[PDB]
């Protein structure tokens, strides 16, 4: 099992999932408990809050990266406002590949719900995105998508070359190259069975990106229509620059 030193430094920024799961569900439980059953949150209202908490984890995770802290808050805000939706989808997908089983959905809190139950409550747009995500979850499981490659895709998503108006773009470029290099070496080395895993890994990023776009727009509109409950930063995320 060969692991490039660069990848080793990336895994150190991953939070402790077992506790953050307790943090989130311990938070959601109290919220519902503070309300009579006329006040209780819908299934959508609850899904909104889990994502907000996940973003708090994402921000704290991003703030833990040495490369990220080398930027000024200006450049930092521009990278997050460009990938926050794609990271959320990515983390959800990886949660299914790891702890998820077909026909079931696993949440950040660790709760295992039936896909059919949750799907029958979503509109046509969400169902198409959810199933499309399920399709990607299956392809990645066949490729034996591991945690080491998961963190690489996160940084690749975070440090986008399509981000414009950056003060230190060269810094973003170097990180892109260093991560692409480390991933390739690790993939071809630890997975000679799939000679093409790396080439196929990068292929899914645009697909996860597209899903991120359609979903981000859908919520921006629902928020404009007032159908989105207030969830702190998640609102200003869409409330600013769409």
């Amino acid at each position: 099992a060969s692991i490039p030193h660069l990848i080793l430094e990336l895994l150190k920024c991953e939070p402790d999932e077992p506790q953050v799961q307790a943090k989130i569900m311990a938070y959601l439980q109290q919220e519902q408990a503070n309300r009579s059953k006329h006040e209780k949150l819908s299934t959508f209202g609850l899904m909104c809050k889990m994502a907000d908490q996940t973003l708090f984890s994402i921000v704290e995770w991003a703030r833990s990266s040495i490369f990220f802290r080398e930027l000024k808050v200006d450049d930092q805000m521009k990278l997050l406002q460009n990938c926050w939706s794609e990271l959320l989808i990515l983390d959800h997908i990886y949660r299914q590949v790891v702890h998820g089983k077909e026909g079931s959905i696993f949440l950040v809190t660790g709760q295992q719900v039936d896909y059919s139950i949750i799907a029958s409550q979503a509109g046509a747009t969400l169902n198409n995105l959810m199933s499309h995500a399920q399709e990607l979850v299956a392809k990645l499981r066949s490729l034996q998508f591991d945690q080491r490659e998961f963190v690489c895709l996160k940084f690749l998503v975070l440090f986008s070359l399509d981000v414009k108006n950056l003060e230190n773009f060269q810094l973003v470029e170097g990180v892109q190259e260093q991560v692409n290099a480390a991933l390739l070496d690790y993939t071809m080395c630890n997975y000679p069975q799939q000679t093409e895993k790396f080439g196929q890994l990068l292929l899914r990023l645009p697909e996860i990106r597209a899903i991120s776009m359609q979903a981000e727009e859908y919520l921006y509109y629902k928020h404009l229509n007032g159908d989105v409950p207030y969830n702190n930063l998640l609102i200003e995320m869409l409330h600013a620059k769409r």
Partner: peptide, 10 residues
């Protein structure tokens, strides 16, 4: 956007 800046600017 000012809230996000507060989280980063901390």
């Amino acid at each position: 956007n000012a809230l996000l800046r507060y989280l980063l600017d901390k």
